[PDB]
Design an enzyme around this catalytic site. Structure first.
Site, PDB file in Angstrom:
ATOM      1  N   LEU A 281      -0.171  -0.321 -10.230  1.00 28.29           N
ATOM      2  CA  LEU A 281      -1.609  -0.493 -10.387  1.00 28.29           C
ATOM      3  C   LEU A 281      -2.324   0.713 -10.961  1.00 28.29           C
ATOM      4  O   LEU A 281      -3.328   0.544 -11.650  1.00 28.29           O
ATOM      5  CB  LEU A 281      -2.285  -0.921  -9.069  1.00 28.29           C
ATOM      6  CG  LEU A 281      -2.020  -2.327  -8.510  1.00 28.29           C
ATOM      7  CD1 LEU A 281      -2.426  -2.399  -7.047  1.00 28.29           C
ATOM      8  CD2 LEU A 281      -2.713  -3.459  -9.302  1.00 28.29           C
ATOM      9  N   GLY A 282      -1.821   1.900 -10.653  1.00 30.74           N
ATOM     10  CA  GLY A 282      -2.476   3.170 -10.939  1.00 30.74           C
ATOM     11  C   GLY A 282      -1.613   4.339 -10.487  1.00 30.74           C
ATOM     12  O   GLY A 282      -0.867   4.220  -9.513  1.00 30.74           O
ATOM     13  N   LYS A 283      -1.656   5.451 -11.226  1.00 24.91           N
ATOM     14  CA  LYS A 283      -1.041   6.726 -10.773  1.00 24.91           C
ATOM     15  C   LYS A 283      -2.175   7.722 -10.816  1.00 24.91           C
ATOM     16  O   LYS A 283      -3.054   7.572 -11.659  1.00 24.91           O
ATOM     17  CB  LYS A 283       0.094   7.249 -11.677  1.00 24.91           C
ATOM     18  CG  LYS A 283       1.166   6.232 -12.186  1.00 24.91           C
ATOM     19  CD  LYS A 283       2.259   5.926 -11.165  1.00 24.91           C
ATOM     20  CE  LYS A 283       3.598   6.653 -11.450  1.00 24.91           C
ATOM     21  NZ  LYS A 283       4.622   6.278 -10.421  1.00 24.91           N
ATOM     22  N   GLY A 284      -2.145   8.740  -9.948  1.00 22.67           N
ATOM     23  CA  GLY A 284      -3.282   9.660  -9.743  1.00 22.67           C
ATOM     24  C   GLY A 284      -3.625  10.535 -10.947  1.00 22.67           C
ATOM     25  O   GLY A 284      -2.750  11.212 -11.525  1.00 22.67           O
TER      26      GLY A 284
ATOM     27  N   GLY B  32      -0.958  10.455  -6.041  1.00 18.83           N
ATOM     28  CA  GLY B  32       0.165   9.516  -5.909  1.00 18.83           C
ATOM     29  C   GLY B  32       0.078   8.286  -6.800  1.00 18.83           C
ATOM     30  O   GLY B  32      -0.346   8.354  -7.962  1.00 18.83           O
ATOM     31  N   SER B  33       0.537   7.160  -6.289  1.00 19.92           N
ATOM     32  CA  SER B  33       0.658   6.009  -7.115  1.00 19.92           C
ATOM     33  C   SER B  33       0.451   4.787  -6.256  1.00 19.92           C
ATOM     34  O   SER B  33       0.886   4.751  -5.115  1.00 19.92           O
ATOM     35  CB  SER B  33       2.025   5.973  -7.817  1.00 19.92           C
ATOM     36  OG  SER B  33       3.022   5.471  -6.968  1.00 19.92           O
TER      37      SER B  33
ATOM     38  N   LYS C  84      -0.049   2.655  -1.351  1.00 21.77           N
ATOM     39  CA  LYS C  84      -0.041   3.978  -1.970  1.00 21.77           C
ATOM     40  C   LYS C  84       1.025   4.858  -1.347  1.00 21.77           C
ATOM     41  O   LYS C  84       1.200   4.897  -0.109  1.00 21.77           O
ATOM     42  CB  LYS C  84      -1.414   4.660  -1.837  1.00 21.77           C
ATOM     43  CG  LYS C  84      -1.439   6.084  -2.334  1.00 21.77           C
ATOM     44  CD  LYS C  84      -2.799   6.801  -2.048  1.00 21.77           C
ATOM     45  CE  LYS C  84      -2.843   8.191  -2.713  1.00 21.77           C
ATOM     46  NZ  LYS C  84      -4.228   8.730  -2.907  1.00 21.77           N
TER      47      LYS C  84
ATOM     48  N   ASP D 171     -15.765  12.004  -5.460  1.00 28.58           N
ATOM     49  CA  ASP D 171     -15.230  11.389  -6.696  1.00 28.58           C
ATOM     50  C   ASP D 171     -15.848  10.004  -7.042  1.00 28.58           C
ATOM     51  O   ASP D 171     -15.194   9.163  -7.586  1.00 28.58           O
ATOM     52  CB  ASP D 171     -13.700  11.329  -6.582  1.00 28.58           C
ATOM     53  CG  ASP D 171     -13.006  11.211  -7.941  1.00 28.58           C
ATOM     54  OD1 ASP D 171     -13.679  11.307  -9.011  1.00 28.58           O
ATOM     55  OD2 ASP D 171     -11.781  10.979  -7.923  1.00 28.58           O
TER      56      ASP D 171
END
Ligand SMILES: Oc1ccc(C2=Nc3ccccc3-c3ccnc4[nH]cc2c34)c(Cl)c1
Length: 287
Positions: A14-17, A18-19, A39, A133
């Site tokens: 889905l996403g890596k910055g 972890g992951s 995550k 953030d």
């Protein structure tokens, strides 16, 4: 209740910055189990583990309609390299969701998301957490009618006696979303979160047109030839001298007013999230 690793079936990255990965938690082993977001850490040094473990405690302590839901932790033999388990929000990131649907989401809907963002942040504040953030790529869409605040990997708890948290050794920083005192002194507070929220509302009303993003505008303002640490030097002087992001095309002037009021150099003069949500809901009532 426990999440056992052998039952978490990988589905998609889905996403890596972890992951972050989409998994099915399928203990019945017949593929009818819940789809969850998971995550884990990329490189498991003690400092990153310590931050992850804090992110897990923070998220676990939050229960709000506009804050992504914690479900649990999956533990591990020898190393205890945890996985964080959460609800999967299926429309994804608000940035990606607004790009897809552009002007086909009207001002009224945008204000519903804005309202819910303020409500979520406000609740966050009653706990003395600084998000640090807030940006549209960190807000998740649950459905047409609901968004949630995500990405708590950078959140800090204020100390008991102080109204800001000072970062000694900054890592990765979204400088174009930062308050001046965060740029200059690495001070973060409810008020710096309000400043960022101003940038989020800008994002929303520009419908994520690329040439209109915060980095784009600010780089045009400072000059595209500025590189590395000189970007920070220039952004700080620009902010000091009252350079700001413009009012986006079509933005109602009362929404623009909120932006500019969030972007005040004088931290004590930025409005509070409680007042923002009151204001934003009044504007919705009016339309
Ligand atoms: O402290 C938090 C708060 C939210 C998430 C989160 N992050 C993502 C990051 C990149 C890309 C997609 C997601 C995502 C997509 C869909 N459902 C989801 N539930 C939860 C997340 C998510 C995480 Cl990992 C940690």
């Amino acid at each position: 209740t426990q999440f056992e690793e052998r039952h978490l079936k990988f589905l998609q990255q889905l996403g890596k910055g972890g992951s972050v990965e989409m998994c099915r938690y399928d203990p019945l082993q017949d593929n009818t189990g819940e789809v969850v977001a998971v995550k884990k850490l990329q490189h498991s040094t003690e400092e990153h583990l310590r931050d992850f473990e804090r992110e897990i405690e923070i998220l676990k302590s939050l229960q709000h309609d506009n804050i992504v839901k914690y479900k649990g932790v999956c533990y591990s033999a020898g190393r205890r390299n945890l996985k964080l388990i959460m609800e999967y929000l299926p429309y994804g990131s608000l940035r990606d969701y607004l790009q897809k649907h552009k002007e086909r989401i009207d001002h009224i809907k945008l204000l519903q998301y804005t309202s819910q963002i303020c409500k979520g942040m406000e609740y966050l504040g009653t706990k003395r957490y600084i998000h640090r953030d807030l940006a549209t790529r960190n807000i998740l869409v649950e459905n047409e009618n609901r968004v949630k605040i995500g990405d708590f990997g950078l959140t800090k708890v204020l100390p008991q006696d102080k109204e800001y948290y000072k970062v000694k050794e900054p890592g990765e920083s979204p400088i174009f979303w930062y308050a001046p005192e965060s740029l200059t002194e690495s001070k973060f507070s409810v008020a710096s979160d309000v400043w960022s929220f101003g940038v989020v509302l800008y994002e929303l009303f520009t419908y994520i047109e690329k040439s209109k993003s915060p980095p784009a505008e600010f780089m045009r303002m400072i000059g595209n030839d500025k590189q590395g640490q000189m970007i920070v030097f220039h952004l700080i002087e620009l902010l000091k001298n009252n350079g700001r992001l413009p009012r986006p095309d079509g933005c109602p002037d009362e929404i623009y007013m909120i932006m500019t009021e969030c972007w005040n150099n004088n931290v004590n003069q930025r409005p509070s999230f409680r007042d923002l949500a009151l204001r934003v809901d009044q504007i919705r009532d009016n339309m």
